Write a protein that binds this ligand. Structure first.
Ligand SMILES: Cc1ccc(C(N)=O)cn1
Ligand SMILES: Cc1ccc(C(N)=O)cn1
Lengths: 265, 264
């Protein structure tokens, strides 16, 4: 992987592995989301981070994901090479955004796109906050100054408001718990695990007959290592759309909400 | 990745990823086991396999793992390049063996080693069987003819018999279930998931203060996608543990194993 000529974006190629693919011998959406995370980490390292700025470490502030939105046109096959380009943009005092473009390395065609919203939080109190001027000035030298959007379109799916699923859910998967492989290097549940948990409540017949085209997920609260989660899904719809909700098994505290759009194979 | 000069082994380099490491910023043993499977799959593809031979596909026969044994001296750090060499050997009528050597790409030193025993099974009836002369003759042209062992040492840990853990277990993790990410391309639970399940019943304090040095796991029966597993562990001692995975309901054994840990 490497920063592009202008130093304002980063590219990396990945060869899809045997254990990374599903029944169609193409990369799962969780494999894609892990690759997105990996290229994001390599971009941060290349521009001098370790993605907390100098002022952030002083104030015990970190970036956390508020939303992930992914659209896939073609999932890369086992053994194929996929190239991913990523860049960040400041969104004033709201937070930051990281975007990605996925391309087939041989054909050069765009096979997917993704966008994510990140908010600043105090590491210890978990209190969200706006971006201060000092922090915004420190990371703007690593971002394109003019807007550069993976999802330019006027009323595009990436910014749509997601409602809260009402009981009773049409489908459910109960008692989901993370194991050590679901944790990151800081012992927090990896953001991709929540995508897998959301998808668990989609019936296997939909997965066997449809291709996942779009997934939008809001992150509200984290699942701790000793927590237990319930995954709830209700059909809202040639295409099938679902509304999703992850909540703690006990008290029913919301941890995530999302939507998925599937196309008939 | 590529076959070596003689065409009897395969090598591949991997750069350790951010999500592949644990709290020490080094690759987990599940990441290592996934890399071992990946280089094994790339070796099979390079020598013409689908690792089922032409005869195997005709009588609906497949290879299945009976045992996995891994010894790690140093786990590669996040961003490091690790080189893995793999090869297969026939073990007469019993089955086949796949071995691996892990090396740091910069220093060239051996950082780990692994060995696995594979048995032939009918894919439909699930009945185990010996290797016929016909199948054995078809894959011997892809193996070194003289023995080449990752674990040469006489009476070494890789061939030790594992006893069955007796109730009550000292530690347990109950109600473990696979999710879609735990399945392979054929909708079977990935062999590496069982390693993660075994390790789940080791207390977090042992993991925080020790380094996993050796893991030996026997595979007896598969966990189906709708099955639920209990992971049981008892200290037998460095720290050594005896492990057992069984189905939550009837208590049917799916795996047994041992782990050896060194104080950090
Ligand atoms: C592409 C794809 C479809 C379904 C799932 C799942 N976990 O159900 C993951 N990836
Ligand atoms: C190297 C290492 C230690 C512990 C575990 C685990 N899952 O407990 C995995 N990998």
């Amino acid at each position: 992987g490497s920063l592009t000529e202008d130093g304002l974006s980063y590219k990396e190629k990945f060869v899809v592995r045997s254990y990374e693919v599903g029944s169609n011998k193409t990369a799962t959406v969780e494999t894609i989301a892990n690759l997105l995370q990996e290229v994001g980490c390599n971009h941060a390292q290349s521009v001098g981070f370790s993605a907390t700025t100098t002022t952030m470490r002083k104030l015990h502030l970190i970036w956390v994901t508020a939303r992930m939105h992914i659209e896939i046109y073609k999932y890369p096959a086992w053994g194929d090479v996929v190239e991913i380009e990523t860049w960040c943009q400041s969104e004033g005092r709201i937070g930051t955004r990281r975007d990605w473009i996925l391309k087939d390395s041989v054909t050069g065609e765009v096979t997917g796109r993704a966008t994510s919203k990140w908010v600043m939080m105090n590491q210890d109190t978990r209190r969200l906050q706006k971006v201060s001027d000092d922090v915004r000035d420190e990371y703007l030298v690593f971002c394109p100054q003019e807007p550069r959007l993976a999802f330019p379109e006027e009323n595009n799916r990436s910014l749509k408001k997601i409602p809260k699923l009402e009981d009773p859910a049409q489908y459910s998967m109960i008692g989901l718990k993370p194991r050590r492989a679901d944790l990151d290097m800081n012992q927090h549940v990896n953001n991709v695990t929540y995508i897998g948990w959301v998808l668990e409540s989609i019936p296997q017949e939909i997965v066997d007959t449809h291709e996942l085209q779009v997934i939008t997920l809001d992150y509200r609260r984290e699942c701790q290592q000793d927590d237990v989660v319930d995954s709830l899904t209700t059909t809202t719809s040639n295409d099938s759309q679902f509304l999703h909700l992850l909540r703690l098994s006990g008290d029913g505290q919301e941890i995530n909400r999302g939507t998925t759009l599937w196309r008939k194979k």
